[PDB]
Design a protein around this ligand. Structure first.
Ligand SMILES: Nc1nc2c(ncn2[C@@H]2O[C@H](COP(=O)(O)OP(=O)(O)NP(=O)(O)O)[C@@H](O)[C@H]2O)c(=O)[nH]1
Ligand SMILES: [Ca+2]
Ligand SMILES: [Mg+2]
Ligand SMILES: [Mg+2]
Length: 166
């Protein structure tokens, strides 16, 4: 059926893998095992449409980001993730957007800004600050928690809906 290729990017430790695993496997990964390049595939119904989700979980740690560019190149939509208790990861978003622009050779790529770990209280990135960044990119801002599942389905499904507007 219809297939959507999603790519999750962002700094190391922000929760990219936890978000994907929570979405696909319905459980929270408590430990931190750095990712190289992993992919998941699941058939789901989104807004009445039976579709196949191909999700690429990329490395956030530089030393592990070998041919990251090559893997991202096939992506149709990207989830740019930062953690609300990690200001540096938020500032790093700019760099990921530029990378996506390169790999896709386009300035109009489907994207969604995600503020993960919203279950934690050590917030240093206020919602408003992220809303402003997203607005400048012309994309949605959504907060999530791979731990409680809050906003997880909404983030991925919203990305699909952004791809459909492309
Ligand atoms: N409290 C809380 N912890 C989270 C959340 N998402 C991820 N974590 C925790 O953050 C740590 C790193 O998460 P992980 O998903 O591995 O991060 P990553 O972005 O995939 N790292 P890497 O880029 O190296 O592959 C883990 O200990 C994980 O449990 C969340 O929403 N809430
Ligand atoms: Ca381990
Ligand atoms: Mg990971
Ligand atoms: Mg501040």
């Amino acid at each position: 059926m219809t297939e959507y290729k999603l790519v999750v990017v962002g700094a190391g430790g922000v929760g990219k893998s936890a978000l994907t695993i929570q979405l696909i496997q319905n459980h929270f990964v408590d430990e931190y095992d750095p990712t190289i390049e992993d992919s998941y595939r699941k058939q789901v119904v989104i807004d009445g449409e039976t579709c196949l989700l191909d999700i690429l979980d990329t490395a956030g740690i530089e030393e592990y980001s070998a041919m990251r560019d090559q893997y991202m190149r096939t992506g149709e939509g990207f989830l740019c993730v930062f953690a609300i208790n990690n200001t540096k990861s938020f500032e790093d978003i700019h760099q990921y957007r530029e990378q996506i622009k390169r790999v896709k050779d386009s300035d109009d790529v489907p994207m969604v800004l995600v503020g993960n770990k919203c279950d934690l209280a050590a917030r240093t990135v206020e919602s408003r600050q992220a809303q402003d960044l997203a607005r400048s990119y012309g994309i949605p801002y959504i907060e999530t928690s791979a731990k409680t599942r809050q906003g997880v389905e909404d983030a991925f499904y919203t990305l699909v809906r952004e791809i459909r507007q492309h």
